[PDB]
């Protein structure tokens, strides 16, 4: 397979015109979103986004709501502090992004933990792999680093990532076992399209697959064709599966000299296919 993970992705945006900010947090197990929070929602709560989390009881929902509400407040202050460190105008909107989480090893222990920040899209501050020290991107982030050293923030993170994060992840994998722990292989085929030159486009499709990780390549006589190929970003189907394609222009009549190759964890071994009308 590959390692499973639990992650949270949060976005804070300042709104000077309104005297406030907006905080949006989403949680994922692997490629599957399962919770959301939006501080603009009336009566804002942590809310379910996958069916298998709805079995958690009231204490879970109250506790998670209290903790994400508190983060939204702290991140509103952090927006103001960072504006000051950079001597930016009070009228402009800025963005503070936060990502943290845990990957699970094959023995059930933490494989890798992370906790990191960006300001206006640029790296700001990050927890090192050791979970015992921080790396700052500039003179402003050094100020924040010294506060977190003084407060022993790393000890708290180390404890959360090795303990609560891994433990929660293992519970969610069990609650959603029938969907999360099952891979679905791609359905594949090659199409042919008349093209603006006397070249023909061949397009290799992979459809209906989970998880999202996949390789699609083209060869002619053992020779990889990546330098002239268009490969689109992997995209959601909307039902928990994904799609991708790879296309290239070939001379007319020569279509069957080309092979598409597909690798995915749902396949028993790698696939070779060609234009097969």
């Amino acid at each position: 397979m590959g390692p499973h993970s639990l992650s949270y992705f949060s976005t804070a945006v300042s709104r000077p015109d309104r005297g406030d900010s907006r905080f949006i947090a989403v949680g994922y197990v692997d490629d599957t979103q399962f919770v959301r929070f939006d501080s603009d929602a009336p009566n804002p709560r942590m809310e379910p986004r996958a069916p298998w989390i709805q079995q958690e009881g009231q204490e879970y929902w109250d506790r998670n709501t209290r903790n994400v509400m508190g983060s939204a407040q702290i991140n509103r202050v952090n927006l103001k502090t960072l504006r000051g460190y950079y001597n930016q105008s009070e009228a402009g909107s800025h963005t503070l992004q936060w990502m943290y989480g845990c990957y699970l090893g094959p023995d059930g222990l933490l494989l890798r933990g992370y906790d990191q920040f960006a300001y206006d899209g640029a790296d700001y501050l990050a927890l090192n792999e050791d979970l015992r020290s921080w790396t700052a991107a500039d003179m402003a982030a050094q100020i924040s680093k010294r506060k977190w050293e003084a407060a022993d923030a790393a000890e708290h993170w180390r404890s959360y990532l090795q303990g609560t994060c891994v433990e929660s992840l293992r519970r969610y994998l069990q609650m959603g076992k029938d969907t999360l722990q099952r891979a679905e292989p791609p359905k594949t085929h090659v199409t042919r399209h008349p093209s603006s030159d006397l070249g023909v486009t061949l397009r290799c499709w992979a459809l209906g697959f989970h998880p999202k990780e996949i390789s699609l390549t083209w060869q002619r006589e053992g020779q990889d064709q990546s330098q002239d190929m268009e490969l689109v970003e992997t995209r959601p189907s909307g039902d928990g599966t994904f799609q991708k394609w790879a296309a290239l222009v070939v001379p007319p009549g020569e279509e069957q000299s080309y092979t598409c190759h597909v690798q995915h964890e749902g396949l028993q071994e790698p696939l070779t296919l060609r234009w097969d009308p």
């Binding site: 994400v68 202050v77 952090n78 959360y160 929660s168």
Partner: peptide, 9 residues
């Protein structure tokens, strides 16, 4: 499970 102590920058 969401973390429970967000730090001031």
């Amino acid at each position: 499970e969401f973390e429970d102590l967000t730090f001031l920058a």
